[model samples]
Target: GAYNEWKKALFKPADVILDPKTANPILLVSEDQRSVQRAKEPQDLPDNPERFNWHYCVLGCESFISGRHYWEVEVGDRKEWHIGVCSKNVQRKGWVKMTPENGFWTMGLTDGNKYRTLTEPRTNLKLPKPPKKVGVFLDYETGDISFYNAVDGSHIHTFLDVSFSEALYPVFRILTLEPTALTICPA
Candidate 1:
């Protein structure tokens, strides 16, 4: 029942949106700024300092320094995805590993069906089925980032007992070249 109880947090939604400035050149962001997908042809854009050069990643426009924040993502039929948050000052120029040591705290669905958190040693996740919608709960002060199956409110995985100093930004990654998109749910 605790899982169901967490569903109450849906009311305290964080309006997460994709920031094109930080998006990899190959990722296409929808006009609504809430959806992103891999594009076959990389768009010609300025190599801004904030843009990711090697990784297929993007950051949310909103950054959090304190308090609790909750948001849901429509993962749909995505085969491979990385959804989570990172420190606002994370390195964006080179091969940035998605690990907390590198200022990243993320969980991802990879190898088609495998789920895992990008921790130091990394933790594998087991679930009856994949969540079509994923819920993210971030408690900045407590230094806990949790993931949930939004469709059922079931807890997935959590990165606990950590410490954060700088502002954090919601991050999204799509490794597969599939046309499928990851969308931010409306508040």
Candidate 2:
């Protein structure tokens, strides 16, 4: 397939590590900064501008200004989660929807059975099966961000023809309080 060929030829794996400074108070970032889980209670942290005050989300330490980048996330059995990339200057202080207009290009899983893209009307996706791992491929020049099933290299969803003016950062949102967590696999 063309997607597989593209993956083989231009896949530049990104080393993503969760940035603790940007994590929400209720999200516990692991010491190694590779994984994050939702906690029952919020932690006492500074009210910094970078830290998410309302959403249970976090950003990756690495930012991409230009070029092709690929990375995988271990979704495991997580029931509700959002994984994708956002602009560095995205709104983090108030109630904000994750939309392309809002500088967010993400796909989310909800209720353990539903998959959707974070668009204005939100595109619902029906996969053959639940994916345990997700691969994100970002081509800045082309303005295409594709999501694939890492286990089989199957396409899931993609945000195409988008324009970016700022640095792009990988963003993770853990919505469930279950023991499951999102892990950024080593590149």
Candidate 3:
């Protein structure tokens, strides 16, 4: 189960920050056409730091409704920033649905560092069987990456984080599901 996996991976209680320069690609998806897209922008990172830090990533699947996912990052003492996951068709033209009211349910990682999927189908929401949602969090102060439940916004578990400050891009890649499980495949 996802809870068991999360508990094992997050037991160490470390921060999970990714480096942008050579970081692996964390793909996001759109619901309509079922296309894949990159999650971060080069300029998205602060210039002074010279590196990008990522907290979460998703594949557009929500609790019972599969749509674009949106989120806001609380950068400790800095201002809160908002970002959204749009379909490839929508992202190509630089159109992102960034609204405070619209957001995705949080999710956590499995024991293998993959996102959790529904074990059974949900009838109440009319969603397809085996629905999936993936997301993560970062503690800038403690440098920890924790997962959450995308449905009810509950904390799932902590995956990884940073320990040393002088390391260059110590953490870079966060896998959703091995060999592309956190990808969009509309059926």
Among all candidates shown, the one with the greatest TM-score: 2
Alpha-carbon lDDT of model 1:
0.88
- Residues 19-64 of candidate 2 have per-residue lDDT tens digits of 9999999999999899999988999999899998998899999899
Off by over 4 Å in 3: 1-131, 159-187
- Give lDDT tens digits, candidate 1, residues 1-187: 5654755553357888889999999998999999998988789988999999888999999899888888889998888999999998899998967899999999989978889988888888998888999989888888899998987877899989779998999999997787678999987
Over 1-187, each residue of candidate 3 has an lDDT whose tens digit, in order, gives: 5643453354422232222332223443334323333544423333222222343232222211121222222211111111222121112112222221122212223333234321222112222222234234444335444444334445544423334132111111233323332222122
Top candidate, metric lDDT: 2
Q: What's the lDDT for all of these models?
A: 0.88, 0.91, 0.29
Clashing pairs in 1: none
Candidate 1, superposed: residue stretches over 4 Å from native:
1-11
Candidate 3 — worst ten consecutive residues by lDDT sum? 74-83
Residue 92 C-alpha lDDT in model 3: 19
User: Lowest lDDT 10-mer window, candidate 1?
Assistant: 3-12
Each model's total of backbone clashes: 0, 0, 12
